[PDB]
């Protein structure tokens, strides 16, 4: 059972801007996704301070970066709070309509695409390097779901019968053919050191 949804006009506009605008500094996508993972980990950490049972679904708070050259995918896994089905459908827990408006207003006032995260829609920077994005998520209060979009104005949501993940979010980037540098260990290390060196959770870069 796959459900197909249309993106709200503003998000479709945001995604088309990210995909079609000439902008060479694409590496910021990884900073933005690690930042989202850090935010999700902060949320489960805070909830666990008053209710330790929230961590029954996994006590480890971390971020894993997994490149796969054969599948041409870069996966970002975290053990954060995860998202309910409602949150996934409602623009992956973001204020994407107002955020997109504020980001568009900023771009007109001199901002550049790298400032996207300041407007709460950093997730969509994944489309700087990915032709398709799959998001697998599990929140303590709901089932495991898979969201997917190749942009083009729609996304799908389905129950995930894949590997159970306990709690958190997995962002699978199906990279564009000319963006395979983001599968190279030295390139990923360089970006993490440049943009995410002080993130408060362990970031483990897997090897193949
Ligand atoms: O699961 C989330 C998330 C992020 C923020 C928040 O307030 C609640 C859930 C998530 C969303 C996007 C992403 O790239 C990574 C993630 O862990």
From Swiss-Prot:
Post-translational events: ISGylated. S-nitrosylated; negatively regulates the ATPase activity and the activation of eNOS by HSP90AA1.
Keyword set, alphabetical order: Acetylation, ATP-binding, Cell membrane, Chaperone, Cytoplasm, Host-virus interaction, Hydrolase, Membrane, Mitochondrion, Nucleotide-binding, Nucleus, Phosphoprotein, S-nitrosylation, Stress response, Ubl conjugation
Family note: Belongs to the heat shock protein 90 family.
GO MF, any single term: histone deacetylase binding
Subcellular location: Nucleus; Cytoplasm; Melanosome; Cell membrane
Protein name in UniProt: Heat shock protein HSP 90-alpha
Full-protein interval shown: 16 to 223 of 732
GO biological process: activation of innate immune response; cardiac muscle cell apoptotic process; cellular response to heat; cellular response to virus; chaperone-mediated autophagy; chaperone-mediated protein complex assembly; mitochondrial transport; neurofibrillary tangle assembly
Chain intervals for the UniProt region annotation (Interaction with NR3C1): 1-208
Domain topic, free-text comment: The TPR repeat-binding motif mediates interaction with TPR repeat-containing proteins like the co-chaperone STUB1.
Subunit (UniProt): Homodimer. Identified in NR3C1/GCR steroid receptor-chaperone complexes formed at least by NR3C1, HSP90AA1 and a variety of proteins containing TPR repeats such as FKBP4, FKBP5, PPID, PPP5C or STIP1. Forms a complex containing HSP90AA1, TSC1 and TSC2; TSC1 is required to recruit TCS2 to the complex. The closed form interacts (via the middle domain and TPR repeat-binding motif) with co-chaperone TSC1 (via C-terminus). Interacts with TOM34. Interacts with TERT; the interaction, together with PTGES3, is required for correct assembly and stabilization of the TERT holoenzyme complex. (Microbial infection) Interacts with herpes simplex virus 1 protein US11; this interaction inhibits TBK1-induced interferon production.
PTM-bearing positions, type N6-acetyllysine: 43, 69
Chain positions recorded as ATP binding sites: 36, 78, 97, 123
Function summary: Molecular chaperone that promotes the maturation, structural maintenance and proper regulation of specific target proteins involved for instance in cell cycle control and signal transduction. Undergoes a functional cycle that is linked to its ATPase activity which is essential for its chaperone activity. This cycle probably induces conformational changes in the client proteins, thereby causing their activation. Interacts dynamically with various co-chaperones that modulate its substrate recognition, ATPase cycle and chaperone function. (Microbial infection) Seems to interfere with N.meningitidis NadA-mediated invasion of human cells. Decreasing HSP90 levels increases adhesion and entry of E.coli expressing NadA into human Chang cells; increasing its levels leads to decreased adhesion and invasion.
Any GO CC annotation of this UniProt entry: membrane
């Amino acid at each position: 059972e796959v459900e197909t949804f249309a993106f709200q006009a503003e998000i479709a506009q945001l995604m088309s801007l990210i995909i079609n605008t000439f902008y060479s500094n694409k590496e910021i996508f990884l900073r933005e996704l690690i930042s989202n993972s850090s935010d999700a980990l902060d949320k489960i950490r805070y909830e666990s301070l008053t209710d330790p049972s929230k961590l029954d679904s996994g006590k480890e708070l971390h971020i894993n970066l997994i490149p796969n050259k054969q599948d041409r995918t870069l996966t970002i896994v975290d053990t954060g709070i995860g998202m309910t089905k409602a949150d996934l459908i409602n623009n992956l827990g973001t204020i994407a309509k107002s955020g997109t408006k504020a980001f568009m207003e900023a771009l007109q006032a001199g901002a550049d695409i790298s400032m996207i995260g300041q407007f709460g829609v950093g997730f969509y920077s994944a489309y700087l390097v990915a032709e398709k994005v799959t998001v697998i998520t599990k929140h303590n209060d709901d089932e495991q779901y898979a969201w997917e979009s190749s942009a083009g104005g729609s996304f799908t949501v389905r129950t995930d019968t894949g590997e159970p993940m306990g709690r958190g979010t997995k962002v699978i980037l199906h990279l564009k053919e000319d963006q395979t540098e983001y599968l190279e260990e030295r390139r990923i290390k360089e970006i993490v050191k440049k943009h995410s060196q002080f993130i408060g959770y362990p970031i483990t870069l897997f090897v193949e």
